[PDB]
From Swiss-Prot:
Subunit structure, as described in the record: Homodimer in cis; binds with high affinity to PVR, forming a heterotetrameric assembly of two TIGIT and two PVR molecules. Binds with lower affinity to NECTIN2 and NECTIN3. Interacts with GRB2. Interacts with NECTIN4.
Protein name (record): T-cell immunoreceptor with Ig and ITIM domains
Cysteines joined through disulfide linkages: C25-C88
Sequence ranges on the Extracellular membrane side: 2-109
Natural source organism: Homo sapiens (Human)
Region spans: Homodimerization: 12-22
The gene coding this protein: TIGIT
Lineage: Eukaryota, Metazoa, Chordata, Craniata, Vertebrata
Domain notes: Contains 1 copy of a cytoplasmic motif that is referred to as the immunoreceptor tyrosine-based inhibitor motif (ITIM). This motif is involved in modulation of cellular responses. The phosphorylated ITIM motif can bind the SH2 domain of several SH2-containing phosphatases.
Tissue: Expressed at low levels on peripheral memory and regulatory CD4+ T-cells and NK cells and is up-regulated following activation of these cells (at protein level).
Glycosylation sites: N12, N81
Stretches assigned to the Ig-like V-type domain: 2-104
Amino acid sequence: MMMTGTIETTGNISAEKGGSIILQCHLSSTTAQVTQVNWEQQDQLLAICNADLGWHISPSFKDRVAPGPGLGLTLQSLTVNDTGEYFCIYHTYPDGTYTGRIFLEVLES
């Protein structure tokens, strides 16, 4: 029997400019305690949450990235430039780190 689990997501996204959308992950098939969540792109931290810090998001992203719902994020004022891979990284005890991936496509149409 598996002691560890898997990380599920809100799907790969097709969106239009100017819209808002929710990104979210969740653990499954493990009882591990989530101690931290990081939302990232390749070498960029968009948001972090843990008991000590609460939510922190860089002031450079404050108009684009909002915390929640839950351990997820809400992206605002989507642009074509937002297109790419987003990662939710969960630190957990005792299992360790799980990483989920969401691909976002933002279109002109």
